[PDB]
Enzyme design. Structure first.
Site, PDB file in Angstrom:
ATOM      1  N   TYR A   1       1.051  -0.813  -0.333  1.00 28.34           N
ATOM      2  CA  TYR A   1       0.350   0.014   0.305  1.00 28.34           C
ATOM      3  C   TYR A   1       1.026   0.851   0.062  1.00 28.34           C
ATOM      4  O   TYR A   1       1.134   1.867  -0.296  1.00 28.34           O
ATOM      5  CB  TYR A   1      -1.234   0.187   1.344  1.00 28.34           C
ATOM      6  CG  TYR A   1      -2.201   0.706   1.039  1.00 28.34           C
ATOM      7  CD1 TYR A   1      -2.709   0.771   0.406  1.00 28.34           C
ATOM      8  CD2 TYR A   1      -1.735   2.090   1.809  1.00 28.34           C
ATOM      9  CE1 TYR A   1      -4.422   1.557   0.615  1.00 28.34           C
ATOM     10  CE2 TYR A   1      -3.111   3.412   2.037  1.00 28.34           C
ATOM     11  CZ  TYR A   1      -3.979   2.683   1.030  1.00 28.34           C
ATOM     12  OH  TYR A   1      -5.094   3.406   1.352  1.00 28.34           O
TER      13      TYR A   1
ATOM     14  N   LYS B   1     -13.578   7.264   9.572  1.00 25.28           N
ATOM     15  CA  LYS B   1     -14.378   6.688   9.895  1.00 25.28           C
ATOM     16  C   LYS B   1     -15.423   6.417   8.612  1.00 25.28           C
ATOM     17  O   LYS B   1     -16.059   7.301   8.125  1.00 25.28           O
ATOM     18  CB  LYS B   1     -15.246   7.487  10.902  1.00 25.28           C
ATOM     19  CG  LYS B   1     -15.680   6.400  11.747  1.00 25.28           C
ATOM     20  CD  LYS B   1     -17.348   7.150  12.894  1.00 25.28           C
ATOM     21  CE  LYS B   1     -18.264   6.620  13.547  1.00 25.28           C
ATOM     22  NZ  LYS B   1     -17.328   4.862  14.179  1.00 25.28           N
TER      23      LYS B   1
ATOM     24  N   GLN C   1       3.965  15.343  12.998  1.00 22.68           N
ATOM     25  CA  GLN C   1       4.394  14.530  14.696  1.00 22.68           C
ATOM     26  C   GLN C   1       5.657  13.466  13.932  1.00 22.68           C
ATOM     27  O   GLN C   1       6.105  13.002  14.416  1.00 22.68           O
ATOM     28  CB  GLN C   1       3.746  14.231  15.625  1.00 22.68           C
ATOM     29  CG  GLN C   1       2.867  13.067  15.490  1.00 22.68           C
ATOM     30  CD  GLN C   1       1.994  12.783  16.786  1.00 22.68           C
ATOM     31  OE1 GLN C   1       2.296  13.638  17.556  1.00 22.68           O
ATOM     32  NE2 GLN C   1       1.423  11.589  16.424  1.00 22.68           N
TER      33      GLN C   1
END
Lengths: 250, 250, 250, 250
Positions: free
Chosen positions: A154, A190, A250
């Site tokens: 992927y 989601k 981050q």
């Protein structure tokens, strides 16, 4: 009316992110063809958004090369010249590089990479030089920027889409084709598929994954795609648009 | 109505990119304070967009630390709680690193870096935890991604804004402050200042600089900022939004 | 002695960058197998560097999946356990995305992407958990970072290698396999193949392409690979090492 | 002998990463001046590596602009023309952007950003056009690529160094100065300072921080700097060299 007069193909448009793109595209005045592999799912999806004057389903596998020129033809017969291609169809395999079978590798890249190639190549050919304000939106992922140890194939596919799209952007820009090409990089979103995988949403919502502490929703991706399809983004090409709740920051 | 109920501060909002941001923000329902150093320029600018119920000018230098809390106070007295900060004020020096005087270095960083710091710090403090859907948009540049041999101090400032903004994004996300922080990275944009520099637009329009073969216009930056100020972008934080005609893609 | 005791496979090691990697690896104490498609070229190449106690040629196409486990076996029979894999074999097609035939696309990705996958997967399996200080060095390119309008398929392949390599790096690190994976990104490098293409070196040497005003030489890539193969780089994994004369800095 | 004939200034060379750079530079044949603020620490450090024919200490604060031309003079009097500048001095503040005082902001940027500027500017002026194979190595950090919510000012400084260094690289390359400029980006590195902070090493060693599951050691940074100072890296300029145990790969 932000997409007034646009005509879009959204591959993998019958579920999740693709469906929300189609929904908001119609809301903003576009006519849309959504594709997917399964007729019942696609017919339901199209009718949930609107009638056949604004949205239609076409059954198509994005890896099916011969079907791509017929998909453009079907779309143009319905709605007139295509202006907007969203290459969103994709599959995932949960394997490390070490554990990926050659069959898995080939199957995923046939959809995620070859399918995007097919749609991009054909989109440039069919939309160039027509004054359409044409826009190709290639769905990469946060996995086009950072690795994930359990998503080897992927990651390869999304890195490929990321940089191939820049090539296409540049060629279109240099030749004054009036076609822009950009990539969208969702974080975790989601969907019913995520809901079917026990514990997935919570894992993805940990602060060490998504700093916002929750995952996104399909409309989050739809609205960046509306921007990119619109003439509002006429100076944006070759760029990466990240909507990820801070994942890659981050 | 994409910015219904928002209240924005746009620094350097009296000219060019900042002015167009202010213009489209008002068009989409925001109330806006624009800042700049020169009263005649700012008063003209505000009135060109609308009356004082939707836009006002405040004279302020973004390097003036003590003026920043009074700017927020003035804005809130006019329009209610600030929701949106666009740190767009900036200056440029055309010097290599080798040729930059310490005075030039300090002067540019006082505006371009310290000013963005001041606005970001105060924005987080004044907008957190209020349910505002607050958004801080820090103007970097293509010069936050790539070097330019004749823009040494400017490159330092834009690289700093790029990464500082991620820090701020992450802290806000992790603490559930309901504040997002993102950077916008314009390429070359046609303005009266560019028009005043003989040969600048043509240099910037060469294909080896901007692949589209022309430079952008201020509205090109305005529309990405509308997206980022709106609740449409509620899952975008810590990210870089590049609108550059392909400059950084090659 | 910087590679004392290492045993390396260098694919595409009979020409250009691969040959120089092999040369400097031998100089630093490694034993090396070089691969290539053409026997006369490979036998000449190996003997130019040294005798069969330190370097051998094996004819192999990196797209030939079944040959990869036999290549490891041949290398280990000669020199003992493999410690170092340099996935350098690659081909190029000079076509835009728009102009790329499906045959060209598939042929290039079979070598440049599938071959790197094969070597990386097998390298992890065969080198993990042996205390070897093992290192996989995947050759991307400047075309893994930026587009080129005339290198569409090549860009896809190099973007894929870039991000797949991070996946592999992370899995190896998290599982304490004692295998590192990194990518090297050459800019333009002078070779006999570049010399055969009239005007190529001069085009690549323009300041708008390579800011140093000349292109590199194969040893420039060899020395970064020596660093990455050595235990000197035991904390480097998942990273991109760019040696490009400034190409991507502007 | 990889640095035969080189003459290096290493700022902040009396501790940690800087000290290890100095150590390996001497091992490879360089003559080195290390700087630091504290005489006892610096005198001890220099003598631990070698005598005054190969290494000397000079007390200097990298924020002290007037001392920089005297540092070059002192180095050249000892060892002849400077060839190599490592801008490694730096300080850290553990504050979010929101919580950073203006005094903290200014103090950190005076060292981490202004000091690097001073050393880079002067290095270019004093080393250009001398055939020295000169190299400026600017110490950024993983915090030049990603944010950390508790390191706001530090992130600003490292982002600034990252992009300023590209400007300098490009100007040097375009003008054929025979000076290269690159950045090094360490991840977490074990030092006495890290050892003094209870729980720091373990926090930094979590897999969600450093995928290798441990932090690095100063020599890990020393060896990439040897590569960059050497003529081995004569085609590398404007680039970022990340040695971080996988931190930024995920």
């Amino acid at each position: 009316d932000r997409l007034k007069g646009k005509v879009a193909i959204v591959t993998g448009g019958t579920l999740g992110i693709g469906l929300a793109i189609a929904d908001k595209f119609v809301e903003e005045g576009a006519k849309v063809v959504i594709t997917g592999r399964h007729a019942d799912v696609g017919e339901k999806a199209a009718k949930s958004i609107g009638g056949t004057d604004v949205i239609r389903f076409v059954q198509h596998d994005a890896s099916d090369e011969a079907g791509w020129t017929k998909l453009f033809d079907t779309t143009e017969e319905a709605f007139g010249p295509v202006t907007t291609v969203v290459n969103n169809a994709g599959i995932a395999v949960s394997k490390s590089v070490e554990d990926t079978t050659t069959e898995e590798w080939r199957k995923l890249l046939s959809v995620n990479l070859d399918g995007v190639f097919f749609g991009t190549r054909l989109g440039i050919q069919r939309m160039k030089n027509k004054g359409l304000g044409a826009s190709i939106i290639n769905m990469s992922s946060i996995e086009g920027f950072v690795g994930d140890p359990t998503l080897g194939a992927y990651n390869a596919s999304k890195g490929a889409v990321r940089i191939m799209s820049k090539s296409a952007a540049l060629d279109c820009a240099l030749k004054d084709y009036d076609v822009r090409v950009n990539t969208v990089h969702p974080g975790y979103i989601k969907t019913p598929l995520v809901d079917d995988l026990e514990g997935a949403e919570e894992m993805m919502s940990q602060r060490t994954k998504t700093p916002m502490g929750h995952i996104g929703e399909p409309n989050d991706i739809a609205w960046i795609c509306v921007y990119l399809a619109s003439d509002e983004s006429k100076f944006a090409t070759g760029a990466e648009f990240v909507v990820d709740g801070g994942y890659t920051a981050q």
